[PDB]
Write an enzyme that holds these catalytic residues in place. Structure first.
Site, short mmCIF file in Angstrom:
data_model
loop_
_atom_site.label_atom_id
_atom_site.label_comp_id
_atom_site.label_asym_id
_atom_site.label_seq_id
_atom_site.Cartn_x
_atom_site.Cartn_y
_atom_site.Cartn_z
N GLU B 338 -49.73 15.88 96.42
CA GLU B 338 -47.93 15.24 95.75
C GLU B 338 -46.92 15.50 95.64
O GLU B 338 -46.09 16.44 95.95
CB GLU B 338 -48.57 16.83 94.94
CG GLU B 338 -47.64 16.97 93.93
CD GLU B 338 -47.64 18.81 93.76
OE1 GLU B 338 -48.14 18.83 94.70
OE2 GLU B 338 -47.35 19.14 92.37
N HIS B 363 -53.01 16.45 91.22
CA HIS B 363 -52.50 15.14 90.77
C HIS B 363 -52.58 13.77 91.85
O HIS B 363 -52.51 13.20 90.14
CB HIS B 363 -51.01 15.64 91.60
CG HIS B 363 -50.95 17.46 91.42
ND1 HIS B 363 -50.52 17.48 90.20
CD2 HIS B 363 -50.94 18.33 92.22
CE1 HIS B 363 -50.18 18.49 90.54
NE2 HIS B 363 -50.42 19.21 91.60
O1 LIG Z 1 -51.84 31.22 92.82
C1 LIG Z 1 -50.16 30.27 92.86
C2 LIG Z 1 -49.79 29.50 94.23
O2 LIG Z 1 -50.23 28.48 93.80
C3 LIG Z 1 -49.37 27.10 93.80
N1 LIG Z 1 -49.26 26.22 92.91
C4 LIG Z 1 -49.32 26.66 91.59
N2 LIG Z 1 -49.56 25.20 91.15
C5 LIG Z 1 -49.39 24.46 92.25
C6 LIG Z 1 -49.23 24.96 93.03
N3 LIG Z 1 -49.09 24.95 94.67
C7 LIG Z 1 -49.26 22.69 94.74
N4 LIG Z 1 -48.64 22.07 93.69
C8 LIG Z 1 -48.52 22.14 92.40
C9 LIG Z 1 -49.21 22.80 91.22
O3 LIG Z 1 -50.70 22.71 90.95
C10 LIG Z 1 -48.34 28.03 95.19
C11 LIG Z 1 -47.98 29.14 94.09
O4 LIG Z 1 -47.32 30.57 94.70
ZN LIG Z 2 -52.58 22.75 90.89
#
Ligand SMILES: OC[C@H]1O[C@@H](n2cnc3c2N=CNC[C@H]3O)C[C@@H]1O
Ligand SMILES: [Zn+2]
Ligand SMILES: *[C@@H]1O[C@H](CO)[C@@H](O[C@@H]2O[C@H](CO)[C@@H](O[C@@H]3O[C@H](CO[C@H]4O[C@H](CO)[C@@H](O)[C@H](O)[C@@H]4O)[C@@H](O)[C@H](O)[C@@H]3O)[C@H](O)[C@H]2NC(C)=O)[C@H](O)[C@H]1NC(C)=O
Ligand SMILES: OC[C@H]1O[C@@H](n2cnc3c2N=CNC[C@H]3O)C[C@@H]1O
Ligand SMILES: *[C@@H]1O[C@H](CO)[C@@H](O)[C@H](O)[C@H]1NC(C)=O
Ligand SMILES: *[C@@H]1O[C@H](CO)[C@@H](O)[C@H](O)[C@H]1NC(C)=O
Ligand SMILES: *[C@@H]1O[C@H](CO)[C@@H](O)[C@H](O)[C@H]1NC(C)=O
Ligand SMILES: *[C@@H]1O[C@H](CO)[C@@H](O)[C@H](O)[C@H]1NC(C)=O
Ligand SMILES: *[C@@H]1O[C@H](CO)[C@@H](O)[C@H](O)[C@H]1NC(C)=O
Ligand SMILES: *[C@@H]1O[C@H](CO)[C@@H](O)[C@H](O)[C@H]1NC(C)=O
Ligand SMILES: *[C@@H]1O[C@H](CO)[C@@H](O)[C@H](O)[C@H]1NC(C)=O
Ligand SMILES: [Zn+2]
Lengths: 494, 494
Positions: B338, B363
């Site tokens: 990503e 992603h």
């Molecule tokens: O459970 C919550 C946590 O998950 C991560 N998180 C949540 N959505 C994404 C995350 N991290 C990575 N890629 C983008 C997206 O898909 C961060 C957050 O603090």
């Molecule tokens: Zn995600």
């Protein structure tokens, strides 16, 4: 032994398999070339890791306005400056030299006039029969205005500032594709009056040759309209006169500088002219390719591609050479798919370019979006003229690392790097675009094989004959070995 | 025959050959589906041509903040709203329900406190033992602050504004990947204290299911940490408790709404934790996959991928299932590449994900930059979860038409459209991302075959067993036929 070790062996197999497909992987470097490659890799990797891990901006991928000085303060840009990069195959004759030359040389001549138009943009022209006849713009002689300015240096700097696209950040002052293209066309209309005067045009083309040679670029393929060169008495010459003027300047320059490979000219028409006029230009191109087979290459349709006519709209004119008995082979250098659209009239010009046997394709920003078009263009040997800074400023991309042709580079696609119109946005002939390609279009483990492959492809995928290609490669190899030896001796202790 | 006509035959053959490579090109539409496709195509072509030729902005390609209301005023978005899209395979449990539910329900419950931290961000928590222990911010009951607010509607809207990412344009107020990622993490830290309370978390997951069913999404695969659910007395439960709570809520929801296919859960760990913690999480995931093979799917490492640890850095923990006697097959759903980088650890996480036999890749923005990785993933059937709005907002891309996975769509690569964290940025469960995909990720001549293929791939590339996939497709086909019939009867004159 260990399952971890077997996994690591398979990982190395897969990663090497993937990374061996990038453009330039075939390059083998001598030990000195590896010294230079390590020198470049150290700086590039430091910048990449500092941006990634410290969570700070990656300047090489930023707007060229903001990143230009930063690039000018990097050692790797000096290395690229000293590097002979071969040929710049995608240039336009009216914006390939410094605006500073126009300001400090062209506007100091007799009968050069200026006026501020209705859009608060300075317009420069040459009229020998007194002030030019126009009521929509109040014309004043540049000599008197410079005398009345008091501060001549500030006057010249302002003259460059009202003409250059890099006075402000284009991504901010013109934050849309339409607005930046309007500024681009305004720049061309500003310089049209003065740059088409015959002596000034000859000297400007001479300056193009000199500036590209000084940047260690030895060969160029320049797109020009070739017609409309005017004199003080009002005489307007045809395209053949412009071709001959360019040919004489090029031959004189080659006589002066043997290290220079030379120049060749492509005729450029506009994407909004009538099909009748475009057919007339195609016939002129056929005549000039017959009469000057070594200096005149072919024909190309330029101008903003999204809102103007498609290649298909001109199809008749573009098929006129092929319908002859015997058929005539007029080469093409189409700008194609310089668009963010998909499956529209603009990007489908790639099919027309491929079917009309185009020699090269300009930009091809939407080429990656069409699989069979990419495959066919690779098979036919049609290289792509990638102009990264041009594609960023003119509204196609904002983060240069998100350029559309990066994966094609990573899969060894026929590509060359050029500057399009360098002078408009105050860019170096090819070293700035080469730095952008090095820092944004290839991975962290790719420094010098990529640049040398670009330099080689600039000769392989040029329009020169095979004999000319061999001779040009010999000259470029001489310059390249000289540069490698000098740089290594300058950096390696003794 | 006619040179023009023969050229046209060649051109149309080439265009048909190229456009058949796109995803969903093999979809055959019934006449009613053709009516719906014609309606959507008319709307989309009107927008595309008006943007291109009249030189006005293409709103669907702009930021979701500015384009949200414009999308909400289109007919195509209405059709997508009524359309059953299958499943949402890339979701996160703490941001898959509207913030409005938390503000209007959760902060109206007892024992809910709030505080403004040192960054002027509201943080909500639940403390059953009086005022919360932390004193770095003065914790006050939301009830009291709402009482003193005067205008309760304004107070609740301010809560949502201080919580939501879409209150301002993230591309302007957080004009950097790092800044917007900081805002994202700040949002999660704002909602962490209140959303992990057991009743509120249970009702929030129930609300996720309800909101996704209301938007005609019948199946979901939600990533969750599953552990840390606490009560008023301070009891903290393990991942098994939260998983069983999710399972019970899902079973009740399935009983209530038979048209729903269901929900399955993935265990997500953070990629900045200790290797020992990640290893223990892998062991817990193995145990939960053994004990609940039908509801628990696998494991995934989430969190910002650029500045944190790589997949190789966790290799030990990631190889633990396979080194057992007999080897254990723990499925993986890795967030991979990503990033805007190339040939770094971040995008080379793709090699680790592929070698670890991942079921799907989250992603994969840099996958197209690596050819052999793309080919191997295509052979192995590893689909890619594309979340367009998330990639735009979190700083990967700005113009969605410049999305990296558009060419892979155009070459029929296995992909599924999802929303990542919709509720974080005020996005509809799946309709908004589907509209973005329709208007930005496929060509001008592609409306409905693409969407139907997305819905089909959402079921084919799910984690359901082969026996369950047939029944899921049966339910989806029933709902899809009802939708097509109703929409056609509402638009067709007869
Ligand atoms: O459970 C919550 C946590 O998950 C991560 N998180 C949540 N959505 C994404 C995350 N991290 C990575 N890629 C983008 C997206 O898909 C961060 C957050 O603090
Ligand atoms: Zn995600
Ligand atoms: C782009 O380049 C293409 C390749 O050069 C061009 O296509 C070629 O066009 C030429 C000239 O028009 C054709 O050559 C002529 O062909 C015909 C027929 O001979 C062929 O066909 C018969 C039966 O179909 C077969 O028996 C023969 O053996 C040949 O195969 C005759 O009039 C002439 O003798 C002459 O050879 C080529 O056939 C054709 N090649 C291909 C591969 O299609 C194309 O026109 C160029 N386009 C542009 C815009 O410049
Ligand atoms: O000779 C001057 C003309 O050239 C066009 N022109 C100049 N640079 C370009 C042009 N056209 C198309 N694509 C982008 C870039 O390559 C416009 C100008 O009026
Ligand atoms: C991050 O910055 C610090 C100082 O600001 C520097 O020492 C360090 O090397 C940087 N990190 C990288 C990976 O360059
Ligand atoms: C040009 O000059 C005018 C007046 O000198 C100034 O107001 C205007 O902003 C300038 N325009 C550009 C594009 O530099
Ligand atoms: C401008 O440059 C040309 C060469 O390109 C030179 O001959 C000429 O003298 C210069 N003009 C002035 C006014 O210095
Ligand atoms: C452009 O605008 C005109 C009027 O402003 C309108 O008639 C036309 O439909 C628009 N769209 C086009 C030409 O695609
Ligand atoms: C919040 O939602 C729950 C679950 O649907 C419901 O029981 C409750 O009445 C709602 N309102 C509150 C807690 O104010
Ligand atoms: C949150 O609210 C405070 C004060 O009410 C305000 O100053 C601040 O800008 C808000 N922040 C956000 C992110 O909305
Ligand atoms: C992936 O699966 C193959 C067989 O399908 C197996 O040989 C290999 O060990 C597996 N790798 C991992 C990391 O599970
Ligand atoms: Zn050009």
């Amino acid at each position: 032994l260990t399952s971890k070790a077997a996994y690591l062996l398979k990982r190395n197999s897969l990663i090497e398999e993937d990374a061996s497909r990038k453009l330039g992987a075939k390059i083998v470097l001598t030990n000195e070339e590896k010294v230079l490659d390590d020198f470049i890799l150290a700086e590039k990797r430091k910048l990449i890791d500092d941006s990634r891990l410290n969570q700070t901006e990656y300047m090489p991928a930023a707007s060229f306005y903001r990143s230009k000085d930063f690039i000018d303060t990097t050692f790797a840009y000096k290395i690229i400056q000293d590097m002979p990069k071969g040929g710049a195959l995608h240039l336009h004759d009216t914006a390939s030299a410094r605006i500073d030359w126009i300001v400090s040389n062209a506007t100091y001549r007799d009968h050069v006039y200026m006026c501020m138009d209705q859009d608060n943009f300075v317009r420069l022209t040459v009229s020998g029969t007194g002030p030019p006849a126009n009521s929509g713009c109040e014309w004043k002689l540049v000599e008197t205005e410079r005398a009345n300015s008091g501060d001549i240096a500030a006057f010249d700097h302002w003259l460059k500032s009202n003409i250059s696209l890099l006075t402000t950040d284009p991504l901010v002052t013109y934050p849309s594709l339409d607005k930046v293209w309007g500024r681009f066309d305004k720049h061309f209309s500003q310089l049209r009056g003065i740059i088409y005067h015959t002596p000034i045009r000859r000297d400007y083309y001479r300056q193009i040759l000199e500036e590209f040679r000084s940047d260690n670029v030895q060969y160029v393929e320049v797109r020009s309209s070739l017609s409309g060169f005017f004199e003080l008495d009002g005489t307007v010459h045809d395209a053949e006169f412009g071709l001959n003027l360019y040919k004489s300047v090029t031959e004189e320059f080659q006589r002066e500088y043997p290290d220079f490979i030379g120049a060749k000219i492509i005729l450029s028409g506009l994407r909004f002219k009538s099909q009748e006029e475009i057919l007339n230009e195609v016939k002129i191109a056929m005549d000039l390719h017959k009469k000057y087979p070594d200096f005149f290459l072919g024909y190309d349709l330029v101008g903003q591609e999204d809102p103007n006519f498609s290649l298909l709209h001109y199809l008749d004119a573009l098929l006129y050479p092929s319908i002859q008995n015997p058929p005539y082979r007029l080469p093409y250098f189409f700008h194609a798919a310089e668009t963010n659209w998909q499956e529209t009239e603009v990007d489908y010009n790639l099919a027309d370019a491929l079917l009309l046997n185009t020699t090269r394709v300009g930009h091809g920003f939407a080429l990656i979006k069409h699989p069979r078009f990419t495959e066919l263009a690779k098979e036919n040997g049609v290289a792509v003229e990638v102009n990264p800074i041009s594609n960023q400023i003119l509204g196609l991309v904002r983060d240069v690392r998100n350029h559309a042709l990066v994966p094609l580079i990573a899969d060894d696609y026929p590509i060359v790097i050029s500057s399009d119109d360098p002078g408009a946005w105050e860019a170096s002939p090819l070293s700035h675009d080469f730095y952008v390609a090095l820092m944004d279009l290839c991975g962290r483990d790719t420094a010098l094989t990529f640049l040398k492959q670009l330099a080689l492809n600039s000769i392989r995928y040029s329009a020169m004959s095979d004999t000319e290609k061999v001779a040009a490669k010999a000259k470029w190899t001489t310059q390249w070995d000289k540069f490698v030896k000098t740089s290594v001796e300058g950096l390696k202790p003794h």
